[PDB]
Amino acid sequence: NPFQFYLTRVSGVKPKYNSGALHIKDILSPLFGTLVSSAQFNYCFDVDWLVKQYPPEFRKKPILLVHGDKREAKAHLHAQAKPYENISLCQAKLDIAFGTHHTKMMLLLYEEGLRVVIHTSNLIHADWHQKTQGIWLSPLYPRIADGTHKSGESPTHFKADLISYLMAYNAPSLKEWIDVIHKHDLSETNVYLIGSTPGRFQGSQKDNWGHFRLKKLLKDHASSMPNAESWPVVGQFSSVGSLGADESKWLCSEFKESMLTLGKESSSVPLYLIYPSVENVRTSLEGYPAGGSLPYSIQTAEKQNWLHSYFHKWSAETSGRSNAMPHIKTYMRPSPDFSKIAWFLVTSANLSKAAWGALEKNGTQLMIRSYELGVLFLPSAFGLDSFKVKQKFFAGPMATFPVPYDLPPELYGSKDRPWIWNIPYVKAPDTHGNMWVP
Ligand SMILES: O=C(O)c1ccc([N+](=O)[O-])cc1C(=O)O
């Protein structure tokens, strides 16, 4: 396969559904490279657990933790890391209210080169145990010879775009990593970077981030087909923000509009949203505790009951993962019969204005609260018009894309409800025999 898109290992599925999955120990293994230094971008960290995931021989190599925590949370993280002398920390600035450092990324510097990992898991045991999570693995990027002058740039501009993302932090520890990236050849990269950084962007910067970045890429590097109006949009996520009092406020006016873009020319496109039902969570491998990682508060939900008619159940027979709750986030554009897709995105971004950006100032400014990162698979970047959808995620012509959940998505039944994490469920017990009492 040319895509290098993986799922994390799930404890409790049959071995056939973990063959070709990756655990964090696999990613950090010496087989992937001889580790010199690493940066771990994330939201939540268990530092004791994280160090144990590195190979023993690599556990004293420098690690930088890039986080967004403030005040007591920030103190707690420093306390976790203090026992480890080789760990430095970078507090990503969050100057807009209610922003989060949500990006999940590893920069792995080897003796042999550099690798970039953009994924969806927090660095805690439970996120890698029984959840559906996504991983993109860069190629091993070789160093550019000292004295040689070449861009090391890819047809997708990934090297410049990654550096731009890191420059947005304005952080001394990340300039080090920028200089490391400058020294390596990333020309083999066949994915496009889609990042979110906090700020208010107008003019030339509008297209740099969030859903305008996606729109810009789809305009420039995808083609519109006949009956494009019949190609649905699919969004799949583990958290929902406040989207407004009806669909015209954000969901179908700027989010959907960015996502239905194809080609340079100038809606009844179906929109499927996939988000675990209460029954999905109750009968999951983890039981109700899985809902601790599906943050949708009752306060927000009751303001937007209109949204839930878009919701479809989590189902992933194709990867044996129907009972492994999703913490991966994906967005894609399938054909009307779901046999092809025009593109696929894996990202940290949930269904949230904070993550994707919201237009301000009479449509001239895109305001983003958070750090997010994902990678976009476009057929043009692989010499293709479209991707065939892989029949079974773990089965076997290598140019079909491994969609990790079932298509078509199944609408909620009349008695289903979206998982809402801060109300009780005491009607029926979960797979461990427990109720949920927030
Ligand atoms: O696990 C995370 O990284 C995470 C952190 C915060 C929020 N949030 O803001 O509600 C959502 C998530 C999520 O990805 O589900």
CSV table of C-alpha atoms in Angstrom, one decimal, residues 18 47 59 70 81 89 98 103 176 191 220 245 256 258 264 270 295 299 338 341 364 376 396 399 405:
chain,number,residue,atom,x,y,z
A,18,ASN,CA,-4.7,-6.6,14.7
A,47,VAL,CA,4.4,10.5,31.4
A,59,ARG,CA,14.3,5.8,27.2
A,70,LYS,CA,-2.2,26.2,32.0
A,81,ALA,CA,7.9,14.9,34.0
A,89,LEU,CA,8.1,20.7,27.9
A,98,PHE,CA,-11.7,27.9,25.1
A,103,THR,CA,-2.9,18.1,17.7
A,176,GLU,CA,15.0,23.4,16.9
A,191,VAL,CA,-0.3,13.6,1.6
A,220,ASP,CA,-6.7,23.2,-6.5
A,245,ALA,CA,-29.5,27.0,16.7
A,256,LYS,CA,-20.4,21.6,4.5
A,258,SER,CA,-16.0,23.8,2.3
A,264,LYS,CA,-12.0,25.4,-9.6
A,270,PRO,CA,-26.2,14.3,1.6
A,295,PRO,CA,-17.2,14.5,25.3
A,299,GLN,CA,-25.8,21.6,28.0
A,338,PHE,CA,-20.0,4.3,-1.5
A,341,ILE,CA,-14.1,8.2,-2.6
A,364,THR,CA,-13.6,38.2,5.9
A,376,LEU,CA,-5.5,14.6,3.4
A,396,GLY,CA,-6.0,-7.7,0.1
A,399,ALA,CA,-4.5,1.3,-4.8
A,405,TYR,CA,-15.7,1.7,9.3
